[PDB]
Amino acid sequence: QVQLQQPGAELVKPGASVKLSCKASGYTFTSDWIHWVKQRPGHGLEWIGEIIPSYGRANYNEKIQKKATLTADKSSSTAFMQLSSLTSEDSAVYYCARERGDGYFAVWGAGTTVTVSSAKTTPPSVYPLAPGSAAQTNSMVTLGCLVKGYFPEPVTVTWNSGSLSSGVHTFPAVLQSDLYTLSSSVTVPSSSWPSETVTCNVAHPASSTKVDKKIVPRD
Amino acid sequence: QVQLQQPGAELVKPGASVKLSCKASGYTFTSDWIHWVKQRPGHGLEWIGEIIPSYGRANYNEKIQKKATLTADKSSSTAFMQLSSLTSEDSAVYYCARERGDGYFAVWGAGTTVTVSSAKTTPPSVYPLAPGSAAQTNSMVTLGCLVKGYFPEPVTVTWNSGSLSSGVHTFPAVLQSDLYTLSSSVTVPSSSWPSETVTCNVAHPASSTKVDKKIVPRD
Amino acid sequence: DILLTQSPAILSVSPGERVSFSCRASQSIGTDIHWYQQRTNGSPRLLIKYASESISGIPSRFSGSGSGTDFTLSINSVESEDIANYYCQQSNRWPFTFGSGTKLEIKRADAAPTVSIFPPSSEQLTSGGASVVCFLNNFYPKDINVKWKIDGSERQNGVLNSWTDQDSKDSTYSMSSTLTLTKDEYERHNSYTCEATHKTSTSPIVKSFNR
Amino acid sequence: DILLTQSPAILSVSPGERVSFSCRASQSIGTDIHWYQQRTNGSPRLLIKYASESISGIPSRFSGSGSGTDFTLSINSVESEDIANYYCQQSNRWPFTFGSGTKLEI
Amino acid sequence: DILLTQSPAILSVSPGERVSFSCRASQSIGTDIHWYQQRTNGSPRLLIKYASESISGIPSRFSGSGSGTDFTLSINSVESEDIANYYCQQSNRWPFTFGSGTKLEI
Amino acid sequence: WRCAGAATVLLVIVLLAGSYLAVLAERGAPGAQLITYPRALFWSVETATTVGYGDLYPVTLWGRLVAVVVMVAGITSFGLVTAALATWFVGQCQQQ
Ligand SMILES: CCCCCCCCCCCCCC(=O)O[C@@H](CO)COC(=O)CCCCCCCC
Ligand SMILES: CCCCCCCCCO
Ligand SMILES: [K+]
C-alpha cells in the first residue's frame, strides 16, 4: 500500500512559505529516518535533509542553501518540511522517502509539485476528442481527451480508472500566457467501441477538482 | 600426477544445461578451495566462482551473469559446476584449479571445451600423408596426418604416444559447414624412417573415439 | 562530500543486448552504493542495494557489481519497460549523495506514425473557442515534421506541438499538434488538414476533415 | 573489484635479452600478486607467487618484484620456450581477479 | 605539507547572483578547512570555520560545504561589500597552510 | 545467584543504546562513517571489548561523548561477563 502520502501540488507566491506533509503508513520503527529529495524539472535527484521522528533530530544539506525546516508529529506519523522565502529556483518536485537506518531508500512518495508564481489557480476544461464522420477505421480506434487552460501543473489523466493502460499517451503540457494545455490518447480494438464505455478521468490536485468525460461516438 | 581431471569436451544444445566434473587426487585438506575459470576463445582468464568441499560453501562472480551452480561430493572428491540455459556466448574452455586457501592456484586442470551448437557429433577421419615417389629427401623427412570432418573441437594428435615431440606441428582447425579439419606434421632424420615406425594417435573426446594410423612409405 | 559520476549520460542500445551503467565515486565507499529507477512522471524505485544484492520485485536481468570506486548496474537483456533514468547513491559517508543520472535509449525498428485528426468538440465551441487536434503516435525514429493546411493553404499561427519521451511500452515516440483558433475564425474555413512528414515514407501521411 | 592492467599487451624482443612484464593494480594490494604462464592449447602454470617468491620447477631466469600497485615479472634471458601468454592475479581483496594478459614474441 | 589550490583565481559575477569559491587539498583533510576575507589595506577576517560552521558576525549569505579534498565557500547573493580576497586554510596536519587566494569581481 | 546474566543484560543495553545514539550523533558531520545502525552495533562491540580495529569511530563531540559512556559502562560490564566465564572454566579445571 502507499506507504508515504504527499499532497498533489502546492502553489506558492514569490516570497511566501509553504509547508509540505508526508504521512507514513506501514511498519513504524524507532530507527526510521524520513528524507526529502528535491528534483528540479529536467534535472536529477537532490538531497535536502533528513529527520528521525523518534528523537526529533534533523539534518540538512550544507552543499546548497538551507531554506527548509524539518519537523514531525509522532502522534499522527506525518513529517513536515517548511520551505520559507521561496523563489523561482525552488519550483520542483519534492519527494519523501523512508530509510530503515541502513543506507538506502526502501519506499518513496509520489512527490509534491511545488510551483512558485504570482498567478492564480485555474481548473482545467476537459473536451472529448472523437473521430470524424469520414475517418476510415482500422482494427484499432484512436481517441482521447483535451485538458486545456489550467494552472499550475500537474494533471493526472487516467482511462477507465486505470482499467485501460496499454496504448495510452499523455503529451507534456505547453505554457500559453499563464495557462497549461495537454492531451491524452487511447488505442482500443475497433469492435470494443462504442460497445464498451471509454472515459478519461482528469484530476487537478492544485484546485482539488476531479471530473470524468465519456468519449461517445460523433453522429 | 594429474591432480585435477576434467572431461574432454561437452556438446550442449542451445538452451540446454551441461554438468562438468573435476575429480581431485593428491593431498585433500579441509582448507582446500576449488575454483572455476572460463576462457572464451581468443580472450583471457575469467573467474567464475569458488567452492570449499569441506563445508559446501560456494561463491560466484557478481561481475558477470551467474549461470552456474557449484556443488561437490566429498565421498568421491569431485566438484561439479552446473551451467544452465547456455547460449553461444558460453562456448569456452572451463578449467578447475585447486587453492590451498592461501591465494594462488597451485595446480590447474586440463580444461573442458564446452561447445553450444544445434549440430551433431561427428567422429574424425584420419588419412596418412606420406611423400610422393619423386620427392628429393633431405637429411630430414616431413610427413603427417590429416584429421578431416569432425565436430566439435578439439582433437588431440600425438606422435608415437609422445615419444616424438620435437619438430611436431598441429595447425589450428578450420570450420567448413559444421565440420572441422586440421593437420599435423613430423620431421625425423631420414635414416630413421621407415626403419622405425611412425604413427599418429588421434583422439576426439566429444565422440569418445581414439584411433592410430601408421605412416608407411608410399610405393 | 562524495561525488558520484555516471559516465556516460545516455546509453543507446539495440533490443536484447546486454547493457551496463557506470558509477564512479570520488573516494572508496566499499560496497555502500544503491541503484534507483525513475520512469517518466514517476518516483524513484530501488533496484539493487549494496552494489549487488537484489530487491524483492525486480527482474532477474537486473544485476550489480563493483567495489571501491567503480560500480556497475547491468541489464542482461533490454526491453521497452527498461527505458528510464538510473541513479546511484552512496551511504558510506555523510551526507548521502546521488549520481548525475544515466538515460537508457533503445534502437527499435522504424515505425510510421499513426495520424489522427480530431475536430473541435461541441462543448468547446459552446464556450466560444475552437481547436483542432492531430495525433502522431508510435513512430520511430523521433525526427518528424507536421504541417497544417487550412483549406489547402499552409497555416502556422496558433499551432502548438508537444513531444513525449521514448515510450516504455514499445520504444516508439509520439507527438501532438493543436491549432487553436477562435470559433469566429474557425467558422471562416471548411477543410483542415494534418500533414505528417516522417522518414519512413516518401509521401507525407495526410489526414484531413471537412467542417 | 581490483582491476589488473597489463601494459603493453605484446612484448617483442630479440633472443638473449632481458624482458619485463608490467602489471598495475587499481589500488594497493601489497604483495598478493601471482604470475601464470599459458602456452598454446595449454593450461595456466604458476610461475611466481607473492610478487617475488619462486615456485618449485621454474627456471631461475624467472623473477618477480614490486609492491603496492606496480608489479613486474622479469625473464633474465629469453629463449623459444618462453613464448606464451602471461597473466597476473591478485589475492588481496575478494574476488580474485586476473589481468588482461601479455603475449611474448621473439 | 598540504597544498591548498584555489581555482580559479578571479571570479567575476553580476550582482545578486550566487557565487562559489573552490579550494582543493592535496590530500584528505576531513573538515578542518577555514575561510578568511581580506579587503584592500585590511587584515584577514574569519568567515567560516570547519568547512560549514558559521561565525558570529557574518552575513547569512556566507555558507560553506565540502569534505575530504574539495571544499566550497558560497555567497548567496553578492553585493559591493563582498569584493575582497578569499583564502582557505587547513588545520588537519602540521604545519597550517594557506590557499593561493581568489579575488571576487562584480 | 548467577548475576552474570544481569551483567550480560547491561552489556547488551549499552551495545544497543550506544549504537543508536552514535548514529544519532554522527549524522550531520561530513565524512562520518558511523551513520548506519547495523555496522554501528559492531562498533559498540569493538569499543566495549577494547579491541578497536579502527574501521569505525566517532568524529563529533557528542559521538565521542557517547563513546566514553560505551567505554565506561561497556568495558566494566564486559569485564564482568568475561570474569564469570573465567571462574566457570576453572570450576571444571579440576574435575579432570
Ligand atoms: C537500533 C538497532 C541497532 C542495531 C540494529 C542491527 C540490525 C542487524 C540487521 C543485520 C542486517 C545486515 C545489514 C547489511 O545488509 O549490511 C552488511 C553488509 O555490509 C553488514 O552487516 C552488519 O552490519 C553486521 C551486523 C552487526 C554485527 C552484530 C554484532 C553482534 C553483537
Ligand atoms: C548532536 C546530537 C546529540 C545526540 C546525543 C545523544 C545523547 C548523548 C549522550 O552522551
Ligand atoms: K587503522
XYZ file of C-alpha atoms in Angstrom, chain E residues 2-6 23-24 33-34 86-90 97-102:
20
model
C 49.251 20.030 2.493
C 48.855 22.123 -0.664
C 45.653 24.175 -0.973
C 44.700 25.015 -4.566
C 42.098 27.732 -5.195
C 39.511 25.048 -2.524
C 41.133 21.686 -3.297
C 39.305 23.965 6.479
C 38.657 27.609 7.347
C 39.278 34.937 -0.030
C 41.695 32.377 1.426
C 41.271 28.820 2.684
C 43.428 27.364 5.452
C 43.693 23.799 6.749
C 48.880 26.152 5.247
C 47.021 28.863 3.351
C 45.495 28.803 -0.098
C 46.624 30.816 -3.092
C 43.646 33.187 -2.848
C 40.694 34.069 -5.089
